[PDB]
Design a protein around this nucleic acid. Structure first.
Lengths: 88, 251, 88, 183, 50, 117, 38, 112
RNA sequence: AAGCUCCUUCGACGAGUCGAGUAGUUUGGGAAUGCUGCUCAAAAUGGGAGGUAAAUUUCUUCUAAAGCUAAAUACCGGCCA
RNA sequence: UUGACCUCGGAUCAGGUAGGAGGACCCGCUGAACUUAAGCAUAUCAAUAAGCGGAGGAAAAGAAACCAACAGGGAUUGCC
């Protein structure tokens, strides 16, 4: 039993996409999550993962809609930031 | 409109992907891989080898298809692939060898099912007139028309055709994007490898005048027949040796 | 191969197994009137009368299993329509 | 020549006439016992081509067998289980052949032809008195009926190498070490 | 006569969904505002909440 | 190659001279029932099928109906006078027909046929 | 008239039809079987 | 038998127009390479060189196609939030990954 | 009663069985090697298995779904030698 | 009212037959594990052992919906 991080295993394209892959041994450019909206969406998945199984179907849906609304508000802020960057 | 196409210029193409009776499991796997490539493709079951070859045209009219990809198998070992426009167009017969399907765990590449590929052709495809006919039949069969409702909206794989020997080598590759060092493309092989040996090109649909003949094709059955003739020739040389040696002893 | 002079053989009565008997074709046509039509043959009959000849051959393959069987079955049922409008 | 008309009628089992008759007879057989005797064959064309005669010594028996499976698959057909149950019921008779008559969603129906080997009409008549010989006791138990020959793979060709001349016999011949006197 | 390559009324692919999502499970989109992408490359938004 | 139980399936042929005596007494027995007749039926001369054995020739099962007629032997009389008849085989060439007609003629020349009862 | 799906087998036909697995043409065509016209 | 006039007439009866002045690249998505790739392969039996020539030939087609498609506004990059059916299943991709772990573990445990 | 011959006359050949789909088992044998269950369910110049790149499925060879039949083969038991 | 035919019954009716044993060899059904792969799970053991049914002096198979590609062979079985 050894870690996949230590072995030089290539990333494989699955239903979950690989995306753009950064080269090994070079600068993996840091993206910051200082924004409160970007802080809320990460917080929604942490609280959802720890809570686990809920018997209620409605409360199970509200646990997912909180994550969905957090993603939408963050995306609107990022698009407004992208528009402000395009103006500048 | 019932073409399942949303485009300003509609390139209406339907391909009928069809297998013969005596195909192998490897031949069936290659059909399964190529049919997953084609959103405008319909799979078809075992075709009677005792039927007539132009009954494929009556078959493709029924399924409303203007292209036929026919997998014809001989002796339970060999594969022949046919490409044809259905009513009147040209028809080419290949001999398919060196098959490696998607299930082989040495490829490491994957792509979207039904996405529109980039067709990589070779310079020899535009020089030789018979390779120009094959290229257009390859562009019709593996086209994946632009506004097709069963297609996928992003591009992640390239289908390549290469003329190296007197044969056509077919490869798939995955467009993998890598961030540039202060984006670039890497290719990872996905799917089917198969070598096509052009045997004949017909003017009719599955029969008609012959426009091109290979005249260099060594069939698999000619290799088998040469081995059996060599086995019998070895035995006959033994009998002629014994007949000569007995005649020498009687002298 | 070797040069051996060929000779023509008598026609084999087993090679006449391909049936051309006028009496058997009489019996098959008379029984078809008496027996009637299968449930799936009624679907083919209705589709051929409505003009959906393509749908008829697809349905009859899915019931029989072969293009040769689907082609013949639509051809016998086509001649039943032809002879029924002649009697009527 | 009524039997040629009957042969063509049995080809069209899904037609209006045959499906109506097979419906009302399936209900009638379920009202009766699982194994019972038929006075006459319900398919006289089929019985006659399988070797039935209207002589004293020939009887016809009807039988149901529950269809389905044991995911394990039985190596003999349901016709074979139908033949063995009739032969146990009529221990003095010999099973000659059997044929399909009806089919339900729960039962398969068969009719079995039996020959009495002690009836004088059978014994004096050649071309049937081979069944009087003691080598033909319980042919359905040993797989000598028509469905038995199909299940044991007794067909000529390169597609039945392991099953011609017996599967266990051919396996045994291929797995003995033959040692001669001068090796 | 040339074949018109159109889908007939009885065809298996006569009606194609707009989602362009295959036989994958739909639990991949559980935490997302959108559900799939159409053929043009723009995501399909979830309708509303009952 | 002894992964199975070969010890319970092993055949030793110590009856090799015993079965030779049994086979020779079986040949003597059918020479006593058929005393002036041969103990074997006459068999045609055929060519071996494959290309390895085209040049060589061997005895076949029975004479064809056509070569039996050309030699003057009726069908229903040939099994009664010791000639094997094969209804499956075909002549397919004049060379196979001529060799068997000559063979049947040579058998006729050497035959003594007894006048019924 | 109210159609109530109680049996699990009618649910199976409902799951096939509502998904893009069996069409309206396939359900009508396969209803012409031996249990039909009785 | 090589009927050069017949093959061209067979082409023109089934040929749809591929011109940069007439039709966009999104219509056809086919690129013809400049080199013949036979010059890149001296020996057919050389598996490593022959596969590198085929990998190379489709590499310019991907680069030429990507430049042309981005010029016309057609989306190219798959987004990270696009989950869809692929040609090889996730079960097959799992065996590919487990095979890669096995050779990676075997090479390093050899050095251990 | 029977064999042959000739012919301006005729010449009937086995269906819930082949076949297609699927599951299990089996084989050196996914042209599924065979077998069995379930669903659908045939044909009449027909059907089955092969040969063939040779230009279209051309050619070759047999008739399945009824039945009988001695010998050459086996034999730790039976009556003996 | 009487008489046919069909189906179904009764009788210590007249005459018959089956069961059990044996099972070395034979025809089917059902069906393991130890072992090997220095562990083990595909595989192998093995389409074996154990279990169930059915015959004879032999049983079974058997007169091509066969082999073949030949200048052709010609039911089955067994040996090399």
């Amino acid at each position: 039993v050894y870690s996949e991080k230590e072995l030089g295993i290539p990333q494989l394209n699955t239903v979950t996409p690989v995306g753009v892959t950064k080269p090994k041994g070079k600068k993996k450019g840091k993206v910051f999550v200082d924004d409160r909206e970007s802080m809320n969406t990460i917080l929604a998945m942490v609280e959802a993962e720890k809570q686990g199984q809920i018997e209620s179907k409605i409360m199970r849906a509200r646990q997912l809609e909180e994550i969905r609304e957090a993603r939408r508000i963050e995306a609107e802020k990022k698009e407004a930031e992208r528009k402000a960057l395009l103006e500048n | 409109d019932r073409s399942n196409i949303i485009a300003e210029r509609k390139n209406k193409q339907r391909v009928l992907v069809l297998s013969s009776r005596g195909v192998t499991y490897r031949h069936r796997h290659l059909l399964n891989d190529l049919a997953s490539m084609l959103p405008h493709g319909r799979k078809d079951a075992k075709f009677d080898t005792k039927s007539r070859l132009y009954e494929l045209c009556e078959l493709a009219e029924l399924y409303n298809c203007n292209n036929v990809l026919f997998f014809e198998a001989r002796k339970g070992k060999d594969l022949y692939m046919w490409f044809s426009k259905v009513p009147n167009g040209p028809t080419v017969k290949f001999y398919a060898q060196n098959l490696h399907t998607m299930e082989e765990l040495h490829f490491q590449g994957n792509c979207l099912k039904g996405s529109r590929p980039i067709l990589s052709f070779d310079a020899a495809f535009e020089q030789e007139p018979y390779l120009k006919v094959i290229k257009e039949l390859f562009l019709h069969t593996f086209g994946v028309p632009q506004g097709h409702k069963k297609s996928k909206p992003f591009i992640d794989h390239v289908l390549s055709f290469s003329v190296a020997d007197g044969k056509i080598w077919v490869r798939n590759y995955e467009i993998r994007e890598v961030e540039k060092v202060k984006t670039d493309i890497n290719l990872i092989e996905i799917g089917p490898r198969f070598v096509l040996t052009p045997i004949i090109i017909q003017e009719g649909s599955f029969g008609g005048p012959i426009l091109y003949e290979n005249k260099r094709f060594i069939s698999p059955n000619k290799i088998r027949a040469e081995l059996r003739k060599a086995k019998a020739a070895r035995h006959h040389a033994r009998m002629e040796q014994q007949r000569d040696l007995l005649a020498r002893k009687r002298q | 191969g070797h040069k051996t002079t060929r000779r023509v053989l008598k026609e084999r009565p087993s090679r006449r197994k391909g049936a051309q008997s006028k009496r058997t074709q009489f019996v098959r046509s008379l029984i078809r009137e008496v027996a009637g039509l299968a449930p799936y043959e009624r679907r083919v009959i209705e589709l051929l009368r409505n003009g959906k000849d393509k749908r008829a051959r697809k349905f009859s393959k899915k019931k029989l299993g072969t293009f040769g069987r689907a082609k013949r079955k639509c051809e016998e049922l086509q001649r039943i329509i032809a002879e029924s409008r002649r009697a009527h | 020549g009524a039997l040629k008309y009957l042969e063509e009628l049995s080809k069209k089992k899904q037609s209006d006439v045959v499906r109506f008759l097979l419906r009302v007879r399936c209900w009638e057989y379920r009202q009766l016992n699982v194994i019972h005797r038929a006075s006459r064959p319900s398919r006289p064309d089929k019985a006659r081509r399988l070797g039935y005669k209207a002589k004293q010594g020939y009887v016809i028996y009807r039988v149901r067998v529950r269809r389905g499976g044991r995911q394990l698959k039985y190596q003999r057909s349901l016709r074979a289980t139908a033949e063995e149950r009739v032969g146990r019921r009529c221990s003095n008779l010999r099973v000659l052949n059997s044929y399909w008559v009806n089919q339900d969603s729960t039962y398969k129906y068969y009719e079995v032809i039996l020959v009495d080997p002690n009836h004088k009409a059978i014994r004096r008549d050649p071309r049937i008195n081979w069944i009087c010989n003691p080598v033909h006791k319980h042919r359905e138990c040993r797989g000598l009926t028509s469905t038995g020959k199909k299940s044991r793979g007794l067909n000529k060709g390169h597609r039945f190498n392991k099953t011609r001349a017996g599967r266990r016999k051919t396996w045994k011949r291929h797995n003995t070490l033959s040692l001669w006197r001068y090796r | 006569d040339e074949i018109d390559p159109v889908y007939d009324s009885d065809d298996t692919d006569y009606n194609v969904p707009v989602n362009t999502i295959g036989n994958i499970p739909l639990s991949f989109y559980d935490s997302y505002p959108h559900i799939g992408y159409d053929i043009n490359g723009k995501k399909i938004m979830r309708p509303a909440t009952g | 190659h002894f992964r199975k139980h070969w010890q319970r399936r092993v055949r030793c042929h110590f009856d090799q001279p015993g079965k030779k005596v049994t086979r020779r007494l079986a040949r003597r027995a059918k020479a006593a029932a058929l005393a002036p007749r041969p103990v074997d039926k006459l068999r045609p001369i055929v060519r071996c099928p494959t290309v390895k054995y085209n040049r060589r020739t061997r005895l076949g099962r029975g004479f064809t109906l056509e070569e039996l007629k050309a030699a003057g032997i009726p069908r229903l009389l040939a099994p009664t006078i010791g000639i094997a008849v094969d209804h499956r085989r075909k002549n397919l060439s004049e060379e196979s027909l001529a060799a068997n007609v000559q063979r049947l003629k040579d058998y006729k020349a050497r035959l003594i046929l007894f006048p019924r009862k | 008239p109210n159609i109530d799906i109680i049996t699990a087998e009618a649910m199976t036909l409902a799951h096939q039809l509502a998904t893009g697995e069996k069409t309206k043409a396939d359900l009508i065509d396969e209803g012409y079987n031996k249990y039909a016209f009785k | 038998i090589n009927n050069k006039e017949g093959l061209l007439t067979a082409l023109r009866r089934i040929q749809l127009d591929i011109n940069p002045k007439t039709t966009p690249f999104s219509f056809h998505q086919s690129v013809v390479a400049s080199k013949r790739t036979e010059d890149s392969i001296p020996q057919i039996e050389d598996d490593l060189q022959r596969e590198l020539a085929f990998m190379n030939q489709a590499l310019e087609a991907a680069r030429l196609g990507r430049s042309l498609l981005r010029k016309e506004g057609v989306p190219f990059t798959r987004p990270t939030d696009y989950f869809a059916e692929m040609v090889r299943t996730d079960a097959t991709m799992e065996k590919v990954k487990q095979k890669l772990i096995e050779e990676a573990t075997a090479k390093k445990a050899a050095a251990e």
